[PDB]
Write a protein that binds this ligand. Sequence first.
Ligand SMILES: *[C@@H]1O[C@H](CO)[C@@H](O)[C@H](O)[C@H]1NC(C)=O
Ligand SMILES: *[C@@H]1O[C@H](CO)[C@@H](O)[C@H](O)[C@H]1NC(C)=O
Ligand SMILES: *[C@@H]1O[C@H](CO)[C@@H](O)[C@H](O)[C@H]1NC(C)=O
Ligand SMILES: *[C@@H]1O[C@H](CO)[C@@H](O)[C@H](O)[C@H]1NC(C)=O
Ligand SMILES: *[C@@H]1O[C@H](CO)[C@@H](O)[C@H](O)[C@H]1NC(C)=O
Ligand SMILES: *[C@@H]1O[C@H](CO)[C@@H](O)[C@H](O)[C@H]1NC(C)=O
Ligand SMILES: *[C@@H]1O[C@H](CO)[C@@H](O)[C@H](O)[C@H]1NC(C)=O
Ligand SMILES: *[C@@H]1O[C@H](CO)[C@@H](O)[C@H](O)[C@H]1NC(C)=O
Ligand SMILES: *[C@@H]1O[C@H](CO)[C@@H](O)[C@H](O)[C@H]1NC(C)=O
Ligand SMILES: *[C@@H]1O[C@H](CO)[C@@H](O)[C@H](O)[C@H]1NC(C)=O
Ligand SMILES: *[C@@H]1O[C@H](CO)[C@@H](O)[C@H](O)[C@H]1NC(C)=O
Ligand SMILES: *[C@@H]1O[C@H](CO)[C@@H](O)[C@H](O)[C@H]1NC(C)=O
Ligand SMILES: *[C@@H]1O[C@H](CO)[C@@H](O)[C@H](O)[C@H]1NC(C)=O
Ligand SMILES: *[C@@H]1O[C@H](CO)[C@@H](O)[C@H](O)[C@H]1NC(C)=O
Ligand SMILES: *[C@@H]1O[C@H](CO)[C@@H](O)[C@H](O)[C@H]1NC(C)=O
Ligand SMILES: *[C@@H]1O[C@H](CO)[C@H](O)[C@H](O)[C@H]1NC(C)=O
Ligand SMILES: *[C@@H]1O[C@H](CO)[C@H](O)[C@H](O)[C@H]1NC(C)=O
Ligand SMILES: *[C@@H]1O[C@H](CO)[C@H](O)[C@H](O)[C@H]1NC(C)=O
Ligand SMILES: *[C@@H]1O[C@H](CO)[C@H](O)[C@H](O)[C@H]1NC(C)=O
Ligand SMILES: [Ca+2]
Ligand SMILES: [Ca+2]
Ligand SMILES: [Ca+2]
Ligand SMILES: [Ca+2]
Ligand SMILES: [Ca+2]
Ligand SMILES: [Ca+2]
Ligand SMILES: [Ca+2]
Ligand SMILES: [Ca+2]
Ligand SMILES: [Ca+2]
Ligand SMILES: [Ca+2]
Ligand SMILES: [Ca+2]
Ligand SMILES: [Ca+2]
Lengths: 400, 130, 258, 833, 129
Amino acid sequence: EEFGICPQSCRNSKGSYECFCVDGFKSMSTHYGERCAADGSPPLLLLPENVRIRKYNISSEKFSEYLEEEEHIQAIDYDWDPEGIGLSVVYYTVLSQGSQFGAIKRAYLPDFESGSNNPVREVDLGLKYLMQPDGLAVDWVGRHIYWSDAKSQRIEVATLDGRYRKWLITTQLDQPAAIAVNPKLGLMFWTDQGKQPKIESAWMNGEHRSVLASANLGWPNGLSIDYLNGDRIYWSDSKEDVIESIKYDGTDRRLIINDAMKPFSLDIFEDQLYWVAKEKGEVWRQNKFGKGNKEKLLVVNPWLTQVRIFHQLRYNQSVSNPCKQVCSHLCLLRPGGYSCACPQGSDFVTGSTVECDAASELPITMPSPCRCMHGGSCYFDENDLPKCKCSSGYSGEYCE
Amino acid sequence: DGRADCLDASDESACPTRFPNGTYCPAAMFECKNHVCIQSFWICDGENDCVDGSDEEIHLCFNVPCESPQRFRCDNSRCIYGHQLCNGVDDCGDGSDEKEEHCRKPTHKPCTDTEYKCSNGNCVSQHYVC
Amino acid sequence: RVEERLYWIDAEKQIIERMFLNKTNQETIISHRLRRAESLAVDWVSRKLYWLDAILDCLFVSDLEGRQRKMLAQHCVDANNTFCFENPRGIVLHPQRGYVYWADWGDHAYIARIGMDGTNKTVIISTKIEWPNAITIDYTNDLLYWADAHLGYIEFSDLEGHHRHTVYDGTLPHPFALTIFEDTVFWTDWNTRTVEKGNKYDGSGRVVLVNTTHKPFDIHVLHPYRQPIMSNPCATNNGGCSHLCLIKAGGRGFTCEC
Amino acid sequence: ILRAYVCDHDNDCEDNSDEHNCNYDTCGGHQFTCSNGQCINQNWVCDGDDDCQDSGDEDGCCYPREWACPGSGRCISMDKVCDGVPDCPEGEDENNATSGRYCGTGLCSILNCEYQCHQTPYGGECFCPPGHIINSNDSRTCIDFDDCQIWGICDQKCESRQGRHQCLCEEGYILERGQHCKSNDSFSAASIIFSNGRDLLVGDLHGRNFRILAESKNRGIVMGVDFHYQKHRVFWTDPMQAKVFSTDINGLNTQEILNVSIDAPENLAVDWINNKLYLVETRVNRIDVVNLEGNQRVTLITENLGHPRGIALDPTVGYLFFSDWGSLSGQPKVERAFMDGSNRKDLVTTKLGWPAGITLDLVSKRVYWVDSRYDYIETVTYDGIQRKTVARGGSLVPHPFGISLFEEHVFFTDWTKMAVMKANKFTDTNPQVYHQSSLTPFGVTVYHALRQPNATNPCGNNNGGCAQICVLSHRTDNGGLGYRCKCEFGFELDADEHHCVAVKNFLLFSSQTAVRGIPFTLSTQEDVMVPVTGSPSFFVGIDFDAQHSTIFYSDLSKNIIYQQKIDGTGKEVITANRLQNVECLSFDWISRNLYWTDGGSKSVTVMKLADKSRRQIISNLNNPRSIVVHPAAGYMFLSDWFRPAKIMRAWSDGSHLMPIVNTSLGWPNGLAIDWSTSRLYWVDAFFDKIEHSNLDGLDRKRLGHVDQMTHPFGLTVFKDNVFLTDWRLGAIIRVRKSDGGDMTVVRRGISSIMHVKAYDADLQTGTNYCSQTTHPNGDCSHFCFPVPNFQRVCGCPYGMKLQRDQMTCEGDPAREPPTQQCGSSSFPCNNGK
Amino acid sequence: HCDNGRCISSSWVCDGDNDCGDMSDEDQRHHCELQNCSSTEFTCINSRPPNRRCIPQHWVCDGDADCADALDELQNCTMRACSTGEFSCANGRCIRQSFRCDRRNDCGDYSDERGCSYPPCRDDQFTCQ
Ligand SMILES: *[C@@H]1O[C@H](CO)[C@@H](O)[C@H](O)[C@H]1NC(C)=O
Ligand SMILES: *[C@@H]1O[C@H](CO)[C@@H](O)[C@H](O)[C@H]1NC(C)=O
Ligand SMILES: *[C@@H]1O[C@H](CO)[C@@H](O)[C@H](O)[C@H]1NC(C)=O
Ligand SMILES: *[C@@H]1O[C@H](CO)[C@@H](O)[C@H](O)[C@H]1NC(C)=O
Ligand SMILES: *[C@@H]1O[C@H](CO)[C@@H](O)[C@H](O)[C@H]1NC(C)=O
Ligand SMILES: *[C@@H]1O[C@H](CO)[C@@H](O)[C@H](O)[C@H]1NC(C)=O
Ligand SMILES: *[C@@H]1O[C@H](CO)[C@@H](O)[C@H](O)[C@H]1NC(C)=O
Ligand SMILES: *[C@@H]1O[C@H](CO)[C@@H](O)[C@H](O)[C@H]1NC(C)=O
Ligand SMILES: *[C@@H]1O[C@H](CO)[C@@H](O)[C@H](O)[C@H]1NC(C)=O
Ligand SMILES: *[C@@H]1O[C@H](CO)[C@@H](O)[C@H](O)[C@H]1NC(C)=O
Ligand SMILES: *[C@@H]1O[C@H](CO)[C@@H](O)[C@H](O)[C@H]1NC(C)=O
Ligand SMILES: *[C@@H]1O[C@H](CO)[C@@H](O)[C@H](O)[C@H]1NC(C)=O
Ligand SMILES: *[C@@H]1O[C@H](CO)[C@@H](O)[C@H](O)[C@H]1NC(C)=O
Ligand SMILES: *[C@@H]1O[C@H](CO)[C@@H](O)[C@H](O)[C@H]1NC(C)=O
Ligand SMILES: *[C@@H]1O[C@H](CO)[C@@H](O)[C@H](O)[C@H]1NC(C)=O
Ligand SMILES: *[C@@H]1O[C@H](CO)[C@H](O)[C@H](O)[C@H]1NC(C)=O
Ligand SMILES: *[C@@H]1O[C@H](CO)[C@H](O)[C@H](O)[C@H]1NC(C)=O
Ligand SMILES: *[C@@H]1O[C@H](CO)[C@H](O)[C@H](O)[C@H]1NC(C)=O
Ligand SMILES: *[C@@H]1O[C@H](CO)[C@H](O)[C@H](O)[C@H]1NC(C)=O
Ligand SMILES: [Ca+2]
Ligand SMILES: [Ca+2]
Ligand SMILES: [Ca+2]
Ligand SMILES: [Ca+2]
Ligand SMILES: [Ca+2]
Ligand SMILES: [Ca+2]
Ligand SMILES: [Ca+2]
Ligand SMILES: [Ca+2]
Ligand SMILES: [Ca+2]
Ligand SMILES: [Ca+2]
Ligand SMILES: [Ca+2]
Ligand SMILES: [Ca+2]
């Protein structure tokens, strides 16, 4: 029942306790389960600057360049290896510039070691009239994208290909800024940076809404969830200068890091918290329970808006999708199950609550990406199809 | 765009008339001499949100209201957020924030009926007394 | 009506709780020294709560926060020791007249009235009464209504018991508590487990609104007119009472008690 | 023409036949009367509209460089204010006014104008240069104005980049004279295609070269014309022959007739993105979708449609526009819908008269429609929010019928002028003529590449995943183009909305214009059974045979009884003689017999279909309105409306007749049998009630009043449900037969729905003596009739004689009964009087 | 929504109570028999609708018959307490002892009159059919 007691799972005993890691994790701390390590390739960091996205590798203390853009990249979220081809997908938002509306973009991120040798193209979900999409969240169970827009004051859900668009919350919103989703619980959490800042949680289908924090909030600008230690919620404040954690039901609230140098984004991995300093362009990490002292990893370009952690086990892919193909347009998770929803400007066919009266839309398959592994090189054929050429010592298709 | 994309704000530094009002930004917003705009809330709160510091020229601080439990006001007539009051940082340069008068430990409640008194300045429920 | 609150008794927990009609706040008001609470009444003018106990066999008065507590009646009500607190299961209040009414289903069943300050202890109904579990008042007629689970009737009389009429006469199997609004009377029945409505004078119209798996225990109507607006005697200075102020029998003036 | 318009003191007819012989009467109430003897609604007297052609209905109660010349809103360019032709209601915009006014500039000397000053008959006027307006605060100086707001500022797009306006044309056009938009030279020269009756003609945009696209003197009137540009095909419809034809723009001896057996097609629209044709049928109140070959057919809109006359399509957004009269209200309206028919909206519902003809503008996203009653051409935006008038009045547009749009001009056909006309799509105070002849032009369309812009067809790949048919639709969220799936006749969509499941049993009902089969549940499939229609027509009685996939229906317009197959592959006539008023039909599937009732002859008749043998079995009835037959039980049930109304039971041959129910019945109507419960159900249309009893009428129960069964007419029973139709709601309702209150409406808006039946082979079961293989046909000669206790009787045709075995009948069937159409007290005559 | 034009909490549907007043929430269209009670619930073996199939586990042993068969009370838990001045009935009820044997059913399941031997009326009394 103690907060700091264990990083992932705890078991009681007549005169003691045991800490244990969940599946996919291993324990190698001096004390069993006091710290956990994650299988697979080492974690990576994703660093969206003003007009470019950069990658960092914690295991090698190495830097790589991934994406360049002509507009201010605001929020980043990713989907891990949705096709099993070894390339994750990244989703990012760009704000409106002058008369040009904002947009949400889709790109491929290789899970293997790669950099500029594999140029990455961009796809646009086609979500029209976006103005200031300050927040982005990905749902890997339901295969949905969730985003928050501060000028329209809305939270909207769509299919990862932008194929169906629904509005979940429109009323009583003041500058929605950050959004996070938990598909296991079927809950979504977001922050409001309005005149009266707030932290709210709702059902991933919008049918239930609650406010978890409405006091001592200056500018909740970042939101992260911890699924390995319960389902805790963590948010960063760059005006209160604090990182705070609550239970997803609001029954518990704690202050984890004090004198956080203007924290603007949060991520949690292997018992450590990672956050960014608004103006310093710095990345700082500490222990997620507030223990010890804080350390500085990178001194990145001052434009760093967010830090994200990229790893197979950050999001539990194993989580089962309950939609079972019953709904015809949209299926949205809720605690203990699912619900059906129609695109905006539509309603259910008379008498039904599982069918919608709206045009059907074809899945938008993303173009073939550059897949040259082992430090190979990628070149486009005359028909624009991608092809690979490999460096000394590597051969076969792509660079397998 | 109203957002400093140059650290020196030289991008917005030469913006033309953005609105026929002669102003550079709309309502429910604050404007700075560098032609950069910021949420009015950030005015006079111990952070140069405008890189040129124009968002908190000390003369501006007197106007913003600050409720005592959620926000704090410093002797410099500048306002600071509640958590900052004893975070260990001089969030306001006068160093009123972090003053021992404010930070010192609480005054324990006087022992009520059904309770007991201890030399320790502590109160114990009567049943626990022995 | 004033606080927009609901008050109820829980016999498994032996507690009295109050909530807001918007369901946003719930509190426990009396949490100890309740042996067998059986009936609860609330007073909207004096800001008081009244309840009956069937183990202590007494009547209690308190302030809606559950802090002040006084015992207002005990033992017998007839100076003959035939009618005495044995199984009190009914309570209704009339502030305009300064009276409290309660019903008891002891082997000697009776309906008795006492004054909100504990004075003028008297018996109103004593004949052809066997199992009262229901007492209610109609303020648009100054009428008193009660139901008998044994004799199967719903009867109405005047506030002093000298006129008697039957809406239903022996036709109800096991009637329980009653409530009245406009030209309609509503009652609960334990053998059929129903909530039914009828015409308060002759029952010429009868329908069943709900039936239930569990026995229905209490039924009331909520509307401002069920708690009419009137001048509180203790309104300005609490009557100068140091602890409790209670409307005198007859509804004029107040009394102060420790 | 609608009867109400006849003798209304206004010419609706092409040749004025609706007013020539009329004797008029006064008008009043919430109305107004004006010059030329016309009556107008009260609100119209002050709304800025010239509803009276004298322009009198606005006298008492405008952009830069424009003036509101009368004392009200008639707004005209500054030159017209004195040009010398009365552009306003009674002059007041002329050199001198008969009302006493004269053109001058005296006030200008006082005004001290900031810019040009102009002469006005009344006083004087001041105006400002482009990009500016005069200000109401002083009527003398100039203020800065958003020129783009001006209707007609540019042909396609306008931008006030620096207050000063600039004009832009879409990617398919080029810009001329700073406001005009012309079509890129890359495309072929634009062409006009129009019909004048027997022939279809092609002409050039300037009206000096004409040719005939198909000169074969072998077809009816060409009514509607539409084209496909990429396929270089032209399509037109002929209602005289009930056919649709397609030709190649070259006219080089290639003419095709589509495989679409549709009754009375009258208007045609083409979809070039999905290769689909959309057809409009006015007498049948139907809109249908087919492919360019006619081989795949879907019914898109049949409910709450009335005489659809004009249709237009935009497949780049998935929009369909049509004009129709509400079946439940009879009011003219213009509607927008999704090309799948799924979503409908009303764009114009006020001041619409007779809205025949619709065309679309694809760069400005506008709808243009024609009204022949109020003599106007008017345009709205796809959302209906903004309305403008291009031309109005009998002088400019007296009787327009067809409309098409290209660039800055609209082309329409007028029957009074008997001409094809050219006008400016923004405002034309003096339309122009493009073709003139002594023949009435019917349809006009314009043929150019930019009239059919390209878009990615969502259906084009893998048929959009639809198992049978794919139709375009509108994306309600993105605003773009999407798709939907449709199933052929005899099929219904599966829960996945992509695969089609075959429908074996369906619900069958009859109406004035059509006989239709629909699923027993709420469904998007408008028709399962191939519809049945005719004209002029009124279908009342319907029964089915499920063993041979046949339906039987009667028509009171022609007084004929027909048998048809649910797949449309067969149509035959059972009888067309001596039928006076066939009110109800019933069929016996064991003996292959058909029974019908006639209120004219007050008799019940039975016929055998294996050899077409006929007999009349009950006569001297009063109002025999409903009949049902039970072969396995050997019983026949019949209802009579004559007071006291009654329900009667008989043996299949009529040898017994007894009133099984004769109390508390006002209009005993449709009768149904429940084979599971051996029960009889009936509906009463006067008392609007549903009652059911056993075959003896000895046990009688009444269902709880259906929440909206205001006036029911027909009843059928299927499984745990009862299905009834309502004659006022125009609906089909579903109810639960044990209590009467599980309530659902399966269809609504069906005009003149009459009877409902349930089609199922499972229902048409059982056996009787006639069926036995040991006694084929019950060993009868000409008729076999089931009677109780598995017995049978052998009947004979009319006029024949029976013999000793009492099973064989021999004699002469050659004589039909006389023509006794007249009732008692009337002498019949040779002249049918 | 009910045929009466009444609105009721959805959980109430197929629960054995005439919550709609017209039984609209407890009829064949709902298919109460097909319902598959939750693990947190309890089941009644002889479930014929409208007799409710599902009972909350908390209710099973409470002293009150929840299933039509009273199976929930026909289980292991004991009979509730009653006063010495009272009589007890299979309904899980305690009634004043004087009520015993007066030909009027006070307990509901007639346990208040079952097995009674009645003394004849006195001379001061009158007798009723
Ligand atoms: C990160 O660095 C380690 C070496 O420290 C290497 O094994 C791993 O493949 C790298 N991951 C990526 C994605 O480059
Ligand atoms: C992931 O989800 C699966 C299935 O819900 C569960 O068995 C597993 O323990 C989860 N693992 C982690 C690391 O959350
Ligand atoms: C002038 O300022 C107001 C706010 O005071 C703003 O709303 C408006 O847009 C500005 N002028 C215009 C009409 O652009
Ligand atoms: C009772 O129901 C009515 C109508 O639904 C509602 O207005 C009222 O607030 C409810 N009261 C309580 C205490 O639930
Ligand atoms: C509930 O009602 C009380 C009494 O009117 C009111 O004081 C309180 O604010 C209400 N609570 C909410 C959450 O609406
Ligand atoms: C009780 O009342 C009766 C009524 O007649 C009276 O006679 C008697 O004295 C009183 N006292 C007792 C205890 O019976
Ligand atoms: C008590 O009640 C009686 C009637 O029951 C009444 O006559 C009397 O005035 C009341 N007050 C006192 C003080 O007796
Ligand atoms: C409620 O009433 C209906 C109809 O009288 C009845 O069938 C059902 O058993 C009743 N339910 C209970 C729990 O008594
Ligand atoms: C005239 O202009 C002034 C501003 O100069 C404005 O306040 C006033 O309302 C205007 N009056 C009219 C009748 O337009
Ligand atoms: C005219 O059409 C050709 C071919 O489509 C195109 O290349 C050209 O740019 C067009 N010109 C204009 C002005 O649109
Ligand atoms: C016409 O339609 C029928 C039925 O759909 C089909 O069998 C036949 O092949 C079609 N003929 C042509 C030429 O398409
Ligand atoms: C449509 O596409 C075809 C094929 O690409 C081309 O020939 C034609 O000019 C296009 N028409 C328009 C209006 O873009
Ligand atoms: C009504 O029907 C009954 C039963 O067949 C019959 O006895 C009676 O004579 C009939 N009455 C009338 C008026 O038809
Ligand atoms: C409940 O559903 C299961 C399948 O999930 C089925 O096998 C079973 O028969 C159902 N009924 C009960 C009482 O378990
Ligand atoms: C409790 O229930 C079990 C299972 O029905 C039974 O075997 C056992 O004898 C019961 N125990 C008591 C105390 O009745
Ligand atoms: C800049 O502001 C001035 C003063 O308001 C004028 O409005 C001027 O027109 C503006 N310049 C432009 C080009 O908009
Ligand atoms: C406790 O609080 C009071 C004010 O409420 C004073 O600050 C007091 O000084 C405190 N008590 C002690 C012992 O210092
Ligand atoms: C003309 O018509 C009105 C009804 O609109 C009345 O019939 C009235 O009698 C008539 N009035 C005149 C003037 O003849
Ligand atoms: C009626 O029928 C008879 C017998 O067929 C004659 O044909 C007669 O000419 C008919 N009469 C009329 C008026 O049709
Ligand atoms: Ca322990
Ligand atoms: Ca600041
Ligand atoms: Ca501080
Ligand atoms: Ca007691
Ligand atoms: Ca007694
Ligand atoms: Ca006319
Ligand atoms: Ca008008
Ligand atoms: Ca003129
Ligand atoms: Ca006309
Ligand atoms: Ca229920
Ligand atoms: Ca129980
Ligand atoms: Ca008894």
